[PDB]
Structures are given as C-alpha cells and as structure tokens.
Scaffold this active site. Structure first.
Site, mmCIF file in Angstrom:
data_model
loop_
_atom_site.group_PDB
_atom_site.id
_atom_site.type_symbol
_atom_site.label_atom_id
_atom_site.label_comp_id
_atom_site.label_asym_id
_atom_site.label_seq_id
_atom_site.Cartn_x
_atom_site.Cartn_y
_atom_site.Cartn_z
ATOM 1 N N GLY A 1 18.155 22.389 -7.119
ATOM 2 C CA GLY A 1 19.457 22.871 -7.514
ATOM 3 C C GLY A 1 20.297 21.740 -8.034
ATOM 4 O O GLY A 1 19.771 20.793 -8.606
ATOM 5 N N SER A 2 21.603 21.826 -7.817
ATOM 6 C CA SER A 2 22.536 20.993 -8.562
ATOM 7 C C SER A 2 22.749 19.604 -7.957
ATOM 8 O O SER A 2 23.593 18.834 -8.424
ATOM 9 C CB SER A 2 23.855 21.742 -8.769
ATOM 10 N N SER A 3 21.975 19.285 -6.932
ATOM 11 C CA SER A 3 21.980 17.927 -6.398
ATOM 12 C C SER A 3 21.701 16.854 -7.432
ATOM 13 O O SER A 3 22.174 15.726 -7.305
ATOM 14 C CB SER A 3 20.944 17.809 -5.307
ATOM 15 N N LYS B 1 26.536 15.325 -2.882
ATOM 16 C CA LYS B 1 26.485 16.410 -3.875
ATOM 17 C C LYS B 1 25.757 17.651 -3.348
ATOM 18 O O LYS B 1 24.775 17.551 -2.599
ATOM 19 C CB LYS B 1 25.859 15.906 -5.197
#
Lengths: 631, 631
Positions: free
Chosen positions: A346-348, A573
């Site tokens: 994901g957006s890590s 994050k």
C-alpha cells in the site's frame, strides 16, 4: 571441557578410525543471554518387531518404567480408556454382557463392540491414576507409536557421564531397546525465537537428504550432523564443532599397537546476535495483544501479523511475527515471514516514489501543484479521502500526510513524460518510466534483497510492466509489486539514516570456544555494510522526513490515531492496500524514532482485514513497542 | 569484433595514465551460434539548457535530423500532440476560439487552455505529421527531456572506427552536442531471450548505484560498465574483459618522453549456453499459437503462460514465457518468470506426494485403499471431484492417471498417524506430518531452490502448517504452496533420471579470451551436478515412472493432449483450482520424453484459465514440442 560422543567407526584392515562429535557453539542475545546451548542426552528407543504382541510390549514398558521416569503429559483420554481395558479385561467384560453375546451371535462386529465399550468408561479412569500405571502407559504408547522396524523414541533426556555407565547395559538388555548418547540443542527461552534459530539435523538423518551435495562438496561425511534451517544453517560455518578423529592400528587379535590423532576436537564458536531478547519477548506480547486489541472488530479472516524492528544506523535486528489463522484466533509463529514472505503493502512506499520522482527530473522539491479526481477513457481514480470534488493544492510533504494517491499518480505521469490532462489516454508503453520508478525504489530496498544474513530472503513479486499503465500507477502507490516487512524496515531506515541504505544483520559478533565462560574473546564483528546512498540531495532526503513527521504528528496525518504523540516522536507513513481473499484488505505501517538522532525503526504488516478505512488502527502495535523501548 | 576505446585519463606530475575499455565475451548457444555479440557504436549525446529556450533546441534537432536517421517507435502520442506547435493557427486560431475569449475575460486560466487543447487534438490530426516531422520529433523528445546541465542520449550510430573520423564534426558546433565511441551489445536473434541475457550497465551509469558495494567489493571502480541483470550479471566474472592500460611520461611542454604498457587488454571470455536457439524460437511460436489456440475459449485473463525444457544432465535447452492483458491480446516477454515467479500448481505434485508416502511408510510399494467422496466434522465437508460414487481397486500407480485427490488425501492422514474414519475431526496438530511431506517434496526440488545459474530464483511461498489442516491436505494435492515452472521441471526430471535430482544450468561452457574470432580454448565446463537421490527405493521410483507412464496414455487426464503420437512420453497433469483475479483456474503439465532412455523433460503453467471442466487440451503445447525434437 569439550565432550565427545562416538559417531563413526570404520574398519579398513588393521586400521580403525573413530570419529567423535563435539558440542556446537552457542547462540546468545546482544547482551550475552544464552539462547541456544547444548545438552548431553541419553536417547532410549524401542524397535518394535514385525511380530510383537501387545502383551509383550506391556511387559517391556513395565520393566522399562522401573528404570526411568516419564512425563505423563502426552497421554490421551483414549490411551487411558484403552489401557484400562488392557489392564482390567474382566471388569470391562462385565459391562458388555449383552454385546458379548451379540458379538458371537452373528449380530454385531468387533468395531461396534469396541466403540460401545469406550463409551461406558467414566469414574474408573482414575483407578490407574495409580501414577505407576500412567508411567507404564506413557512408555507403552510410544512403543505403539510408529513403524515395524523403525526405532521409536521413548525418552531423550539429560544424562550424565556416570548415569549412562550405570543404566545403558540394563536398558539394552530389554528386547526392542537401545540407548545412545546425543548432542541436543536446549532452549532456555523455550519457544521465543525457535523459527529463527533453526534446527541441527538429527543423528538419524546424516546430512539431510536434499542438502547432500551442498555439504559433501564442503568436506562433510554423509553421517555428520549439520545446521539445516536458518541460523543453524547460515552460521554452520562457525557454530559447527570440529569433531575428534582417531586412527588406531590393531594386530590380528584386535590389540591396538599404535594410534594417532588425525584431529583433536574443537567446540564450535559462540555467536552473539543483534537481538535484545527482552525486547523480543515484549514485541511478541504486544503483537499478540494488539492482534486481538481487535476484539474481532471484523478481522477473523485476518491471517498474518508481522513486525520487524531494527537500529537504523547499523542494520542490527530485533524482530518477530505471527500467523493468526482466526476462524478461532489460534496462531503459529510466522517468525521467518518477516523476510521470507511477500505482501501487497500500500501507500507506505510513497516516500520512495517521491525520491525516484526527484532523481529523474519529474518533480522538484516543494512542488505544490494540485490534486483532484482523475479522468481517463473509462478510468476514474479518486484519491482515498475525497472522491467527488475537493480541488486542493498540496506539496510533497502534505501528500504523504494525506496518503494522497493522486499526487503520486501525477508524478508518475510526469515521470512518463505525459503530465495529466483530463480525458487523456493513459500512456500505452510505460516500460521506460516503470524501469525508472523501480530503480528509484530499489535504492531504498523496495524490490531488491536487503541482504540479511539468513537464507531464503525474497525480494517480492516483480512482474513485467510494459503496456499496463494501470499497474504502473498502482506501483507508485504500492499496489503492484509486493514487498517484505524487512524491505519496509530497510526502506524507512535509509530514510532515517539520511539516505544510507544498510545491510541488516541478525548476527552481531562471533566469539571463540568455551564450556564455561559466557563469552570467549571476539573473533569477528558482523557489520552493517553500507549498500549504497540514495541518488538524492540533502533537501530531497530531508523533505521525505518532514513529510513523515507530519503524517504521524499533524492531525490530517493518516497516523494521528496511533502515533499522534507519545514518549518520543515517531515519523512514518501509512499503508493501505486492497486485495482478494472475496475482497479483504492488507494494512501497513512503517516509521522510526526518535526524530533528531534516530535509534529505532520498525515495519508492521497486517494481511486480509475485512476492512474499509474509517475504523481500524493497527499502528497501535508500533506505538506500544515504541512506548516500551523508550520507557 | 576487435578494438578498444578511451575510458579513463589520469594525470599527476607529468605522468599520464590512459585506460581503454574492451569488448565483453560473446554468449553462444550449445552448438556455436552467436546470441550476444558486440558492436562499435558512436553514441551521439546532447547537452544544453542554460543558454536555451526551445525554439533553438528544435533548430538543433532539425539540423541534426539530416545527418542521422532515427527509429521512430519511441515517439509517444503526447510527443506528437505537443509537437503541434509547428501547426500554428490550427490549434489556436481554429479549434480553441471559445476558450480564447474565456481567457480574455479571465474566466479561464492558461493551464486549462492547454488541458483543453490537448483533449481536442485527435489522432487524425497527428497524421498531419510527415515522416521527416517524426524524425525531428524522435530527436527532439530526447533533447526536450533534458536535465539542463546534463547530457542526453540521441543515438547509437553503427559506425566505423574509420568513419567516426569523418563525422565527429560536432564539438558544440551543433551547439549542444557531443560524441563518443562505445561498446554495445548486439543481438542477432533480436528480442528472443533478451530477458535472460540481461543488460550491461550504460557508460553514463558506471556501476549502477544500487549495486555499489556489490561491485566496489570486487576491485571495480565507479566508472566501469558492469553486468546489471541476469546472464550479464551472473557470468560477469568471465564475460568482462581486462582493460588496456597505458602509462606515459611527459615533460612540462606535453611531449611524451617515455611510455610503457601495463596491459594490452583482452576481450572477455566467451560463454556457450545449453540453450538451442532453434529450439527456443519454436517454443515461443508454439506458445503464441497454443494460447491463441485457446484465445477463443474464454481465456479473458489467462495472464501467464510458461514453459521450461531440458534434458536430465545439461539443464536448459529451452525457456520462455508470456504475460497477457485481458486477451486484449498483448503479449510481453516474461521468460524470467520460469524461475522467479511462484504459481499455484496442482495434481503434478502427486508423484512426490506418493514418494513422501513411501519414505514415511504411510503407503507401501503398491497400495490399494479405495476412493470415496468422504466426509468429516463441521457437519459436512467432503472431497474428490464427485459427491456420491465409490470408486474401487486402484493402485498407487493408478491414482496418478485419475488425478485422484482422494488417494493423496488418504495418504496425508495415514502419514499423520490417523487413517480415515468418517466424521473424524481435523487433526488439530499437523506440525510433524506436514514437515515429513515437505521434506519429501524437497527431495525432488519442489519447495527448495533448484540451484539454477541465474539470479533471483525463488523457492515458493511457504506458509506455516501446524494447526490449520484446512491447508495440510491441499498440500498433498498441491494447493497450499506455490512453485515455479523450473522447480516442476527439476522435479519431473528427477523422475526421468531414476531418482537423481539434478542442478539445472543454462551455462554450458566457458572458453578463454581468444583474440580473433572463433571460440577459444576451453576454460571451464559447467556441469549438471547431482544434488541428491530420493531415498525412495529402486522400485518405488519405477512405480512413479510406471504411474506416470500409464497416465498420459490412459485416463479413460492428459490422455487428450498426449494421446500417443510421436510421443513415447510419460508425464502428469495439474488440474488445480484458484479463485482470485474473482474465481479462475490454473493449469499445469509436467512430463518427460523418450520413456526408454529419457532425453527431454518439460513443464508448463497457465494461470487464470477461467475454465474448470474437462476440455482445454492446453497441454497440446507440450505435445507440440516433442515431435520437433524427436523426428
């Protein structure tokens, strides 16, 4: 005090060579706490003949129980019901008067008999709680446990040199029975990192069969015991004990006339790990708590939870994980899944993509330009926290705070030489940009092996990217290529360390031989090698950090409700990825601490939560461990 | 062929050192055909920006377009749109008159004008671009994507050393450009196998930043060009050439007063590969035929198709794969997939499942217990591919032709201690039996790395197996742990080779640096090392041979496609079931050719065939190749 057990005796003609095994080196935590030690053990086996009766085996077990003690803990409720009928065939009979006649009527058959007899036993299991009985039964069940020429192990416990001398002969007198001495690993912290320590091959297996060539080609004999899993295998090198070899020369009647030491023994070398086993035990506790801090708030088909934690400046590891296959919530350790298993993250990864977008001149630092719902020929991609309108500006920092999908989409298009205009066709060939994006991400360890000193690390699933612009877009979000918890850890770390990517290591120092001293002198420091520095300027680097602070510490940050602020500030994050199990969700967190001269970093992965966003919050594990280490 | 090029020039105190670079070793097929060769290219670079608008850039690009000719494939649709600033009042004066005024009353901003222009410019208008227009554009785009102070590649000109001469006129007399001679790889078989060949780093690059420590550890310097991927990286040691280094002594005036040579240089060593290219180019065509031959049957994201072929000693004669989109139909090269991607297989595993059976004495050498759609607790769950009928006296060998899940399912439990009784509960701990099965499978290559001589080989996703026997039986029928096509091939081959698992290798022979063109004195021969035997017995092996031998030729699966033709081939199919994509199926086939004295082995994998029922002869790709080899 190097001990030796006999292992191999080869007769040539007059020459007999005797090889003796010696203790392997110990494994200890970063503070010299013994994690893996050795024990001299007597192993007593039964070798059930091809035609041996139940009445024979009970008699062996009886005489056997005179000699040794057992632990009753394996005895099943069925062992007891069966043993009772074995012991009291008259009282058993008298409960089945009707069925006995039905047995020899023609009516029922033995299987129906036995099942009816098992159901009538209750208050009389206790009659053999005559713990003398349970002792016999404990041995007896193992004698019945296996195959008709294979020795079944009955007991393998700590024997002393003089004990073995008393009992081995009288044990061996019993039919079926043999005894031997064996080196066996013991584990004072019990189960805590067993996955990671790995196993040494059993005396029975030599070199494990599928490792034959690996080990024969390095001088071993097919009969040697060797490390085979993880740490025992990775550091077989240093841990192995150089066995003792003797060459005897006899006369015809067997008298030794001469002898020589082909090689005396050498205890293996002790290995110290980077790991703080107190912190390890807590992490696993906090992991387990935080796993069901979810009081089944949906996630009963959530199936993996992993944590890695390390020191960002030197690659040192302190870090484990669980596979909670709920549909109970009963779980195994998926210890090694931290670097062996590969997950949609994901957006890590958004930190890395900006960096990639910096180093090719796709975006400059501070770039403020605006985000939106997006339109292509059919495709609409709405960022994850407003889907309709909103037509807000931003900068690079802020996009990370928001976990803004559309700032990353915009950069990806600029990377592809094809900036967004509404109703554009997605670019048809994205080979070149994709390659550029991947090489960016590789620099912080996303998509490349971190280099950890343990076998079987993976780099993640990495599929062709030429004509699938959708996937390219998903890549810049972190929803194409799967990554590893270790990779995430390596990645936030190189951010923490101002762009220096370091080869993580679970081995700290290699020492020298000892039976007594809880460490010998140093022989080798195992170093966190610098693998490279990001191809990025100080101002690009620092900007990811600022972005990472304000995702955790400013209130529109997707990590306020876990990290908001606590005993020390965490920059990090969020990870948000959608996947199929029936559609579920992976969820991810990465971060590090403290902000000004960092000394801890971490990565977290939860897989297949049922979850839409507006609730679930797994970063509390991150908060909880950081709360513990920084007490 | 021959030559060297200026790479480095160092001065200090009237001592100059010139380092010239040299051609890498060629890479050849097993007979001698050139796969990877070299060329002397002129690289034409462009480096301006600080002085420069863009109207003169186009001027530079158009001057240049007369000197050189460019391949126009790399021109994007956006490139063509933007390059409509040459068509004037046609964009503006004609198509944007409503948006013209909207700017003038401030109702619209300049970025919205550009966004609306781009959307209006259609593909028929892009055809107003002439062939020469496209030439300047090919050049222009490379300039226009230029970091300002930094040089940008325009072209690699095929050139003479004795031509460079004439045309290297442009110093900055085409005001931005520069020029140099470089060694470039040549590929006579075009795009075939490029994935596996790999790339050597670009002259700009030097050592690619990610690989810094990997190559600096080796005495390399940052400027060196090095193998970045696959073969180029794997055999970097032998493929590289030794540079020519000169040392000269000048006076203050610059005049060379002495000189000496430290190394004349030598071309890298030639690597011969086991691949046959006239085997390799057929399989690809056969691959494209046999998935267009299943284009019409519903495969709307069958997205992966792979084949590996070899002989049981000398590894790979053949390796290729494609990924597809939607059957929009686009294939992209994915040969590397065969050893880097993991895929849920199926019934093909069972020959190994049956071997772990015999080693742990679950089954005997020929064993009979029967098929039945049998049931457990929960209140329900049953099994194998039908739901009522009770199928009879099939042997171990007969179970493989049926692809019977039931015999395997039997075996797992019989190996787990407790044979089947209806309405039994799940064995709640299967740590031990799952291990024994797993080790069993590792003996034939399923579950460990094969040891191939190419980087990034994966061993498969391997999850813990202890308390979730919802997975343990699936493992006996190959639906818990993913393998690669290569792992399947090593496996089927271990069976062809009478139990001897072999290390596949793509490298056949290394030859010393010859210095004009034939392939030189043999330096080293890459052998297919026996990694291990199965400790299954000489007749337990023959019975999996026997089981495979009657399974391709009478299930009356696989009989459909392998219906004996040229083909004296044994084999086995993998029928097995996924879901996620939303449910599809994966189809796999392994098998081996001439049964008498086997010379060919293969494996194939299709992923996300939507199609369960007994139809898709997709293993006909398998049959398709056997004829070619054995005529």
């Amino acid at each position: 005090a190097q001990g030796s057990h006999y292992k191999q005796i080869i007769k040539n003609d007059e020459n007999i060579t005797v090889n003796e095994s010696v203790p392997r080196g110990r494994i200890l935590d970063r503070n010299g706490k013994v994690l893996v030690d050795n024990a001299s053990k007597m192993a007593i086996t039964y070798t059930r003949g091809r035609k041996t009766t139940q009445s024979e085996m009970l008699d062996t077990a009886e005489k056997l129980s005179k000699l040794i003690k057992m632990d009753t803990k394996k005895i099943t409720e069925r062992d007891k019901k069966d043993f009772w009928i074995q012991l009291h065939p008259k009282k058993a009979k008298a409960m089945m008067t009707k069925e006995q006649a039905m047995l020899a009527d023609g009516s029922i058959k033995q299987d129906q008999y036995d099942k009816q007899l098992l159901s009538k036993i209750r208050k009389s299991q206790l009659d053999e709680l005559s713990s003398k009985d349970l002792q016999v039964l404990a041995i007896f069940r193992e004698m019945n446990a296996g195959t008709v020429l294979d020795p079944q192990m009955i007991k393998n416990e700590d024997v002393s040199e003089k004990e073995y001398a008393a009992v081995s002969q009288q044990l061996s007198k019993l039919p079926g029975v043999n005894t031997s001495m064996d080196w066996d690993r013991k584990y004072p912290y019990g189960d805590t990192l067993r996955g990671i320590f790995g196993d040494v091959s059993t005396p029975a297996e030599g070199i494990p069969k599928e490792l034959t060539e690996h080990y024969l080609s390095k001088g071993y004999s097919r009969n040697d015991r060797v490390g085979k899993s993880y740490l025992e295998y990775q550091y077989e090198d240093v841990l192995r004990g150089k066995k003792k070899e003797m060459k005897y020369t006899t006369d015809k009647s067997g008298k030794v006339t001469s002898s020589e030491v082909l090689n005396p023994g050498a205890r293996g070398q002790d290995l110290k790990l980077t790991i703080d086993i107190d912190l390890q035990k807590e992490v696993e506790a906090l992991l387990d708590k935080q796993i069901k801090k979810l009081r089944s708030q949906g996630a009963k088909d959530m199936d993996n939870a992993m944590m890695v934690v390390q020191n960002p400046k030197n690659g040192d590891i302190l870090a484990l994980a669980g596979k909670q296959i709920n549909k109970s919530g009963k779980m195994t350790d998926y210890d090694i899944g931290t670097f062996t298993s590969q997950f949609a993250v994901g957006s890590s990864v958004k930190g890395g993509t900006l960096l990639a977008g910096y180093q090719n001149k796709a975006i400059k630092v501070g770039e403020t330009m605006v985000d939106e719902p997006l339109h292509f020929q059919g495709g609409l991609t709405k960022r994850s926290y407003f889907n309709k309108n909103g037509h807000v500006s931003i900068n690079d920092k802020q996009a990370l705070m928001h976990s803004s999908n559309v700032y990353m989409f915009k950069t990806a298009l600029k990377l592809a030489g094809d900036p967004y205009y509404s109703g554009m066709a997605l670019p048809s060939d994205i080979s070149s940009p994709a390659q550029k994006l991947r090489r960016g991400l590789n620099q912080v360890g996303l998509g490349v092996k971190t280099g950890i000193d343990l076998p079987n690390e993976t780099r993640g699933q990495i599929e062709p990217l030429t004509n699938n612009p959708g996937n390219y877009l998903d890549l810049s979000i972190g929803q194409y290529d799967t990554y590893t918890p270790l990779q995430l850890s390596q990645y936030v770390s190189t951010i923490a360390n101002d762009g220096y990517r370091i080869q993580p290591h679970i081995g700290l120092t290699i020492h020298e031989s000892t039976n007594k001293d809880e460490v010998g002198p140093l022989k080798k420091k195992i170093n966190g090698t610098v693998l490279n520095k990001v191809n990025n300027t100080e101002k690009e680097i620092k900007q990811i950090q600022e972005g990472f602070k304000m995702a955790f510490n400013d209130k529109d940050g997707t990590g306020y409700v876990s990290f908001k602020d606590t005993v020390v500030p965490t920059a990090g994050k969020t990870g948000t990825a959608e996947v199929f199990q029936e559609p579920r969700v992976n969820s991810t967190y990465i971060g590090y601490a403290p902000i000004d001269d960092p000394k801890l970093a971490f990565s977290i992965v939860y897989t297949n939560q049922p979850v839409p966003p507006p609730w679930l919050t797994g970063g509390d594990l991150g908060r909880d461990v950081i709360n513990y280490y920084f007490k």
